[PDB]
Amino acid sequence: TCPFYKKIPGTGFTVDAFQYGVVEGCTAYFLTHFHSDHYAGLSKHFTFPVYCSEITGNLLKNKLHVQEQYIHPLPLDTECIVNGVKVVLLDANHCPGAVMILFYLPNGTVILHTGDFRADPSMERSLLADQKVHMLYLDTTYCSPEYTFPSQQEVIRFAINTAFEAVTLNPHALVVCGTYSIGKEKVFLAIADVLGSKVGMSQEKYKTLQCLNIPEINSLITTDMCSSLVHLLPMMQINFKGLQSHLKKCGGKYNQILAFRPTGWTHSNKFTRIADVIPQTKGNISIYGIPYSEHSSYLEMKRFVQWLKPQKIIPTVNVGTWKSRSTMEKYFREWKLEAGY
Template sequence: MSTFSGLFEEIPFISADRFDGENLRSKIFFLSHCHMDHMRGLDRPEGLPGPLYTSAVSRVLVRKQFPNVQDVRVLEIGSAEEISYESDGEEYRVVVTALPARHCPGSIMLLIQYRELKILYTGDFRLTKADLDSKFASLRQLEPDVVYLDSSFLKKCYPEFPTQTESIKKICDLITEWTSISPQHKVIIRIPAQYGSEFLFMEIGRKLKQKIYVANEQLEKYIFFPDMDQCISSNLKECNIFSLQKHEKGMFGSFHYRIIQPSALFWKNWTRGQPICKEENKNTIRVAYSSHSSYTELKDFIEFVKPKKVQLNVVSKMPEEMYKCLDEILGELEQSSKERKEPAIVKSRFDNLFRVPNSGYNRKYEEPIRMPIKRVKL
């Protein structure tokens, strides 16, 4: 759950992923992806006092879900866009590049250049070391002045997660194993939250060529995602797979059902080589699945981009462990730079431990394309 305030200390009058309170004084706005903890304030009847920049996928979702937000503009992946805006007679310019975040359909990171500063805002993201090495070469040794980091799992008790490909394969195997017994055998996928499972459902539908049942209240949210209508349905009778957060006894009559619970929080201290599923009881199996980076992936990311300072976008109620982990990572990075006689990384202490609580994944995107700067003036 994001605790990012929406405001950037280094850049005046812009906001990202929060659209209420002090953020309404901003002149331009950015949305990294369409999950509700990043969209607070978009439902205000007056809309926003400035344009909202986001990905092409997220623009479709915002326009359908929040018709009151009328000025929604697309950031093309890999394209540097210069945006000018004014406040109190003073003109400001930022250059913004959207990069794929691989968290959910349409999710993006934002590389923002303001004067001599480079700020990288990750939103929510899941990038492995292999992703960084093969498809994000432009971020290698970027040395941004600040990274605003998705720190959901910046804890040593979450050292690793299976890749999403591995987790989805296991879930599909478990579904096929059970539903092939007889037409009376059904599967319930018990999701941990209302959002975050879009890519999972799309991949299950694509691989198994089956639709997943979702209740009408869920359908209203998912249907806005492109291609989701190909993998979900509200018709109980045509489905063998059901997405539910809970279900009542007798809901499925005489059917035999297996419950599969994809989750990340449950899998503390998981490391590669261990099983990625665990049988809870006769009918329930847990599967390790995460759309956020693990501790090791976060460490790899920080070492890859070499930031001068890191701000955490997700801070728990007991943040000491997270900041201790961050200090250790930055300390190791500083020491490594000294040994290689590279420019020293600035290791920052973090006074602002408690941020104001906050109210794409698309595999076709590869290495960001170098394109001329596109200039926009408000």
């Protein structure tokens, strides 16, 4: 049964709730982004509206094969009427096609649903700056003060450096980047740009990338592996046994791999900075973990919430245990007492 934090009061709207069959009264099913925990359930056989971004739409049609008529894409930053409700889509600074949704209820309540988001000060000068938000449905993925991590731009720096160094030292070295979903495309696109290459990948990953409205994308990616010295692989495959396996296939064309595992938070964030990172090394293969996050840090979250001054907060992540629920409420209370709302 669909949980209450996936439903929107005073509407026939639900958000990311595609895994429960028909939800009684739901006239519309919103999908915030193309990540499988949020879309679990969609298929070609859906015959209810789905509202999403254009980009999410493309992935819906081309990867899951939903029929064009039931995919209502909407532009961002545009006041849109939907079954006699004003709604707006806002960029979530998560993965490609990810949005937050503003719901403007008939009774006068305003609700923000963040989806998955990485809070940022640029949001504080968006359409949100114009009016009061009574209810916040919040991505609480890293809602605890141990969760710190660097800026995305700091990380892209380190990367552009590690890679460009090695390739200049050894010109027969390959760069490999791990992936398992959309998101974090900046990691491999930036490395390739500094190296003068396209990024090589499987047919299926090329297909996914061609749905994202990246400008100039035809110049940046290829399915011809031989011709490219930045390769994408499954994250499952980014290990010694698997990187050996892959290093065989390339047919004596490279004598060293240099890999990157963009990850979220790990416990080594607590003790080691980004400028002071190292890899595991089993012979000629070297694997970097690098903490490129597409979710809010605790400080980033805190700031956004204290600016918004919501009257109520409804967590959407880590809501499955009473201990997590309790811990989160305590932080919300602190924030509110500090900030005077």
